[PDB]
Structure 1
């Protein structure tokens, strides 16, 4: 068709980006991460035991208050790199940026405190392909496309650096927003259909890693840039960063002096300065500052792979092109 549509996002502390969707009649509202690294939609269920504290603190979908609910009840387990959610399939009308779709989604009944007690979002809207969808459930974007309303088979992500009288982020469904990028889009083709993943031909500090070529997943649902444990260990040894439990840190004074990190993607060199990857919460030598780069071990067939999360998308406005199986990058502004 001709419609373009946007979802306004909230930026919590540069680590979580999420927007609002409505589910049911009348619409029950949820905060959701829009995630190119997965393909399922889930929100917490009212049938979630309150022994899960995460279900006490998030919005719960109540099927009993929706006149448009359609039962399914097939068990669903979604295993992310950092935690599992479990529950069952349901169908209802999901409203996202003024588009209503009939969507099968997971009602989560099992929701661990880690990491979900630390989540400002309630659930996830997977923006990946049907190939990676658990239960072979049609993803929301595939459903929006079937309706023939959008101007193009594309969606774009803007993640703001600032988090205070400004929008935290934006997703354009059906195009991109020229107000949030500049210069030309650089288009990189995907390795295959089914995964938002591209060939990376080197990771540079100041090339040390990925010299013989590796995979880079473009994961809007992730906070950080992640690599494999051994990839990250060598990167951090080169940065002089100390390994902690869940993050890598430097002494806050050393922060500004940290070298640039480059990702060789599609023939061009995508460079992040220390300002882009260090949480400069201080300049004290008595204080430690977290890096926005950690380890994530992703098993076959998706991994081993690097993941380009919010750290990367903050600098680079990202267009996801389902029609041509490619990703466009442009300088965010």
Structure 2
């Protein structure tokens, strides 16, 4: 089974899921960095403008809904949502599963007013699930219908298909060459060992090793504040409140950035990480690499998001606790 994804400005990749009977439709991001499912709730005060601007789940319109009510708060890197748990049937890519998910009643304008999607579907392990709620992928596996306990992500370039998730395998149509796997450091987290990060000609980063969280829900490739400061200084980039910029005319001149993973070098060109909006020296162009301090126990750690996945088709293998990469087609 595959899920068709929409690509919004190269920063938000989302697909549709249906909740309830009759189905209530929601745009959601599939995030390997978290493990809970959530959508905005009809019980969310309209004082939260983000709730006024998104699809709201109304339990009183679903005959398959099952009440629970346990309160839950979900804390992400860029924001927080709070609400309560509910159960209902969820349709994802043709598969139907009963699932416990969050009905959000508090959703801050910043950053959710800037969200194209309505909610999130955690693709992480149950070990990271808040409130110990069984993750949707564990529930699907329990049905014993998938041919493989693995799911794969394909994120297309902005263009204007936006992207695609395959539940149960991989799509040969969107990758070439063969996969090269890296074993997970531990079950419970889609995190892997990274042997090093090189910029141009000088592996001046992640010497002695570091961690890499393969995060489909992250728009960019991120590193700790210290690591990014070095990487950026090397790039000649200036720091701003929420990102790093470079004078556009110099975007094409930026050096390659490479990521040593499992005995293979994964290299990005400047075209791969800079939002080349123009070429003027009087304009600033943002970079798809940010500074993000991810808290323990998962962090500190680098995060390989869309910027990376766009270049490399990614397969998450639950049966063998490994992650595979292959050149995206």
TM range (shorter): over 0.9
5+ residue gaps, structure 1, are: none
Please report the RMSD computed on the Cα atoms of aligned residues, expressed in angstroms: 0.7
Shift of 1:265: 0.5
Shift of 1:212: 1.1
Separation in structure 2 between the aligned mates of residue 209 and residue 77 of structure 1, nearest angstrom: 35
Q: Which residue of 1 aligns with 2:196?
A: 202
Q: After superposition, what is the alpha-carbon deviation per residue over 1:39-88, rounded to whole angstroms, capped at 9, x for unaligned?
A: 00000000001111100000000001000000000000001111110000
Q: How does 1:1-333 map to 2 (within 5 A)?
A: 5-162=1-158, 167-206=161-200, 207-333=203-329
Q: Secondary structure, in 3 states, of the residue corresponding to 1:131?
A: helix
Q: Secondary structure, in 3 states, of the residue corresponding to 1:114?
A: helix
Q: Secondary structure, in 3 states, of the residue corresponding to 1:58?
A: coil
Separation in structure 2 between the aligned mates of residue 312 and residue 115 of structure 1, nearest angstrom: 23
Shift of 1:166: 7.1
Q: After superposition, what is the alpha-carbon deviation per residue over 1:122-158, rounded to whole angstroms, capped at 9, x for unaligned?
A: 0000000000000000000000000000000000000
Separation in structure 2 between the aligned mates of residue 18 and residue 233 of structure 1, nearest angstrom: 31
Separation in structure 2 between the aligned mates of residue 294 and residue 320 of structure 1, nearest angstrom: 24
Separation in structure 2 between the aligned mates of residue 30 and residue 91 of structure 1, nearest angstrom: 16
Select between 184-193 and 166-175 the one with higher mean Cα deviation: 166-175
Q: Secondary structure, in 3 states, of the residue corresponding to 1:109?
A: strand
Separation in structure 2 between the aligned mates of residue 223 and residue 81 of structure 1, nearest angstrom: 12
Shift of 1:297: 0.7
Structure 1 moving runs of 4+ over 3 Å: none
Q: Secondary structure, in 3 states, of the residue corresponding to 1:311?
A: helix
Shift of 1:114: 1.2
Separation in structure 2 between the aligned mates of residue 277 and residue 293 of structure 1, nearest angstrom: 7
Separation in structure 2 between the aligned mates of residue 125 and residue 37 of structure 1, nearest angstrom: 10
Q: Secondary structure, in 3 states, of the residue corresponding to 2:324?
A: strand
Q: Secondary structure, in 3 states, of the residue corresponding to 1:64?
A: helix
Q: After superposition, what is the alpha-carbon deviation per residue over 1:151-171, rounded to whole angstroms, capped at 9, x for unaligned?
A: 000000000013xx8700000
Separation in structure 2 between the aligned mates of residue 166 and residue 149 of structure 1, nearest angstrom: 35
Separation in structure 2 between the aligned mates of residue 202 and residue 281 of structure 1, nearest angstrom: 30
TM-score when scaled to structure 2?
Answer: 0.99
